[model samples]
Target: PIEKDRNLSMVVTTDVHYFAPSLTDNGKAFEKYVAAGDGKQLAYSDEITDAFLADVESKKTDVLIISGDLTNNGEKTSHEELAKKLTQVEKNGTQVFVVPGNHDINNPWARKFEKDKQLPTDTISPTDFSKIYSDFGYEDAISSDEFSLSYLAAPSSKVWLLMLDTAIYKTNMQQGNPTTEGGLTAGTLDWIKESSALAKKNGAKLIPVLHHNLTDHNDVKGYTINYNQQVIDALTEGAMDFSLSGHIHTQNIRSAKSTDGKEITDIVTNALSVFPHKYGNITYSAKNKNFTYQSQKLDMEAWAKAQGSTDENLLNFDQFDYETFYNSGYDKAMMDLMTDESYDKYNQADKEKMADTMGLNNMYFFAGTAPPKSDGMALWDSAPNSFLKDYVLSSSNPPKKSNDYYVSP
Candidate 1:
């Protein structure tokens, strides 16, 4: 058994999707791209990142785990800049670990924005990724997998961290895009078993971290890893009960049981570049054999005010980001409804109501809150047989428990 008094603290954030500041000048091309985006605050990525790192340093966190999507599109410059920032955090006493997301390696879509055009930029290979991020987790890892970027680290005397790389980047260049789906190879799975045994022999608890979820979080598909049940089985066999993951960009917690009935919990952290800028604060107690996880939001407005920023968006970042995300969903819903042939059947008032319903529901869903029952039912009744109706139906069933916090027994 491990030391009874050992307590480990970790801060988890993911899907930064950091676009290099030098890659864009907020020009026409960048504006157009932002307009069509999924409401990620790419414009303030650097500021957001800086604020987050500063918080980590101030808190004196023991470990920082970044689940993935470190860059916008595997931009070499973005990775370089992010590495520099992480170096500062590490120097401040926090040990950082990271895994590659779908957009972080061998992506052909890497580009830089100019006045009215987007130009191709260099993307890094798998080897380049390992080299660039060596200081973060690779250099001091207790063990490294020969088949993948997976590595094991001893963040504390009582805990072993298994940072697994589940991104499929091998065919990214040839396929002309990065693979959205994630998977683990046979060799990597074997390596995990070996690492688990090593941790067991050392009398340390094993905690796995990865980019893609090990269990389905919601109705949305394609974010969970392939052969996820097998992965869960491997972890459960090793007596690991918890996993940290990201990639769906939503704050979610789901539990699944292996075939042998052992339970494993997977917690997905929200994207740091999105509205609310959330992260996870976890405290693991060896004496109690339990852990407490609380979701925390970055205080962007306070940080902006402290920095003497004149930008109104940063000054009122909460409201700005909320409206930005809410309106994006509303606009998308309106566009979708208008594009359909039956759009003319509904009056303008009804159309606006439907859009409002979608906007509010999506806002709540993305924030890991349950949508209002009245709004969902109202939309379901008004928009019969429509995709908007389907969306309402799908979002009606949120997790019963609180998504923002959890306590493992």
Candidate 2:
């Protein structure tokens, strides 16, 4: 068991989608995705990731858990670069654990895109993935699942990291399909049960980390694991304490109840590459019987400065485009969910009116805030997208702590 008096501090980030500009092989394709990311500017992934790692070093965190999607696609070159970067962080004395995202294995899009075209590149197989990320989770694992890449690690004597591989890379119906849906296999589920039991026997608490969400963090279809109930059943049976997951690109911590009222907290951190560009910092205390969670944003400007960039605008490009990025998808999704017609099918006039009225509401949801009223266009009933505002502000609510966590009990 972990030293009872030593508190465990961890940093969690996910959906890194770390895009590297591979010039040696079809560099144009790599460049194209970066430019046309619709303001995401994915090419900055390396610098952003570098910034993230720099903070890890400075913060001197004990464990760093990257829930998955380590690369844009399972590119061997991308994987190699990420591995080297992670090696530097590990050398600084932080233990890291990673699981395979659906996009991180045998993916055809692992290639480059050039001139509205796709160029084939080498992709990593399951075995290759294991070899590449061995340092992160595979080799040092206490035990590994037979049917999947799932593994168990004792990051601390009292804390067990149950890294679950929830991704399904391909299917027999159509070979080489790159779908993002994932499920837990029976063998993997059984492994989780056995591992949880063993951790309990050894006087450790199990914390599950995976690429897929266990519950509907977002009410959208396909957001949670396909076999969510079964997964929950396994967790409850094993008496798991807490779980961490990413994939939905949202910052949230919600409580889930088992059939017999066993409450487990599920934390979903935002994508490191997304607007907020934050990571979840969690400190677990065995003595207090509680957790302290904080979301920390990456200092992109600081990173740019270290790189010796003179342009302030360029330095702050990712941070400055926050509202536009948030507005881009949140508005459309909110509008679509409220109206009967699809967002795209709406006429320009109607779309503009909806957009005009939803500025505050958009900021509220996208920026993670309570409903804000601005421009007199947003009042619960008067808003054009009131139905969406209602659902977002009221129904989809998940209670969270104030910038830090405290156990309800």
Candidate 3:
């Protein structure tokens, strides 16, 4: 077996969403944002940017990947602010690679909801997304009518990171925003193919970075949330190492399930503004066939607290609550699935095999955390394991409209 090299090191962050340095008030509103905050946005962008720059300078990292949502409103002003902040990161000594997230596009609520139409047609075409950020190392070798939101480029000879832009602004029948979607227009996929093909000539590992999850993070089977099989298969066949991205803002690293129960281990670096305010530290020791990861939390508590002025008013963590609320219900159901009468044959097997055949995904919940001891290497002994497990038993039937448990925190 070939061993992996440990010579590579890079810093990663996503969902910058820079709110931009303060407005006419000379940091007044910014002050308000900070003082009233739990540090979930750019209220502390400057501070966090400083910390990010500090990290690169102190560590002299080889590369930096800002995996999308660079702007708070997709405003030119915001982009410029991001550019300025990123310049500091670059100046601090690191090659920075950034991609766009949904928020890097138009405000769907104001434009799509009020105006009653998808407005990528009005404000800016998706093509403009790539052009706007092109100066940041997105190679301009080829032009295509499709994927105005994507580009392929290299910062180092050893790696190729493909950036996929997930443009937002479309509304569904109920008019709610769509959470996940993937389709590589023929042109973009072609560019990816060409770049990735060239990248393989050197035995480099390909790492594609996009905004949307290639598969649903929650789905144990695979990413059915979006039709991204072709892209995944293509990249896998191309010898891609792993694609890093963020969208669900999920803090954990787990597989997106396939219907047949294969887990797509595409990595995701969660939000910097949200808890755990961290970056994904992916370490690949190919010689060891060991691709491991650690989360790097922002080290600036003063700045974190100082930036968000509405932490009190912004205390609503409904989405986080919703995830916990629903997942607990589902976990219970899963427990039942693993022990039903229909599954008794598997359940009767030896412990190890039976465990393997049942809830394989659940076993990985704390894979890298330290073994039981007082070391605190791990925090979860298994997560808040379904406080709503009974919900699973109660949910013998399918979820009804009223069955939707409302969540707020």
Candidate 4:
């Protein structure tokens, strides 16, 4: 059983990928970029962020943790704008903490979309990131890692957060794009060990927060941190039983064992930029030393109504966002089917049906809900045996439990 009085209450969200509205002119280039995207509502990012922050303020959450992917790219302007918003939030009394994502530092891909071009935009280095977000987590950190942006902060007497910087952005400029993979350095691992020991000494529960997964969620490669077993060993040895992560932009919770056989749980929150834009509400009970988390979707329609916006998309935001996300997946599937050498073999009507099923399945998968097995089987039967068919078949496997809510054992 849990106590009514909570020791700590926090809100967690990630992968905002918030593009500064000033950077886009709603032009052809921007539209093209949006068209090629994977269902992130970039145009309405500001409204979504505002609404989420407003909720956080109303609830007076004790702390807010954003795992990473704080911007569309490492745009300096975007970071500045976001920091301004965060500063205001902090003023209202909730403490904020963040870790850098792969897209957040030293990226040469940062750009501004003009009428027909993507002009170069200034990107931030690690130092700039720390400085820009100093108020959030850097300025008052109990200890800062010598090698990375990772730091340790005691948000409350009962909780210490080990915010890890697992991004691989050191050579992003030389590579012409940000590295998608995330990892930790040897120095950082040592720092984590020390930080954990310090927290234990202080009689505080240590919680690791990072931008990359310590456990493999969905068997996907590259999203999990490099040398993850070693990372897990360090965490488990320090008695850190749970961690928070983002970057795969999918809601999931998985457990893994360290070399010593101790268990650790990783909760991956979905992206705030996508459909069903959601955040996690967590409560820690001192009486039982337990943590409970539940996912809540942002009420965009209510936000729009409150603001008295006339945009139809805002007026019926849920449906509009769902359709936008669903259609993107549907169109992507259609494009793949049309371009494949086997295109002519499949009838157009069947192709459309397959795409429709795939689109819906994708929505379910990304949202961390179980897709109907019948839908997956139907798509499998209609399509030729390929990666897409295998995907649908495998994605139909039900999760062991609900992904939206979790309680630590």
Write one digit per residue (lDDT tens) for candidate 3, span 1-409: 1123445566677876665453213344344444333235445455556655676677777668777777554555566666776666666556677766666654442121112222221222344555565556564422222534666656555565666665444442144443234455666667777767777885666667777767655423212225577666656656554567776554444444434444445666656665445677655454553445566655664433455635432233333322333343234434554655544443223322322222222212211111122211111122134322222122222223211111111
Q: For candidate 1, write residues 182-238 as lDDT tens digits.
A: 999888999999999999998788889999999998764569999899999998998
Candidate 2: give the clashing pairs: 2-157, 2-158, 29-113
- Candidate 4, residues 191-211, lDDT tens digits: the string is 999999999998888889999
Candidate 2 regions off by >4 Å? Answer: 1-5, 23-41, 113-117, 172-176, 311-314, 330-350, 356-367, 374-409
Clashes of 2: 3
Q: Indicate whether candidate 2 or candidate 4 has the larger TM-score.
A: 4
Query: How should the candidates be ordered by lDDT, best one leading?
Result: 4, 1, 2, 3
TM-score of 3: 0.61
lDDT of 3: 0.50
Q: After superposition, how far is residue 170 of candidate 4 from its true place, in Å?
A: 0.9
Off by over 4 Å in 1: 1-5, 373-376, 386-388
The digit string of per-residue lDDT tens for model 2 on 278-390 reads: 78888878786456767787777877888898866548765465655646545564456446553556556555555544544443443344444433233333434544656
User: Candidates' TM-scores?
Assistant: 0.96, 0.85, 0.61, 0.96
Clashing pairs in 1: none
Supply the TM-score for candidate 2. Answer: 0.85
What lDDT score is found at residue 249 in candidate 2? Answer: 71
State the lDDT at 342 in candidate 2.
39
Which pairs clash (backbone N, Cα, C closer than 3 Å) in model 4?
none
lDDT comparison, 1 vs 4, better candidate: 4
lDDT of each candidate versus the true structure: 0.87, 0.72, 0.50, 0.87
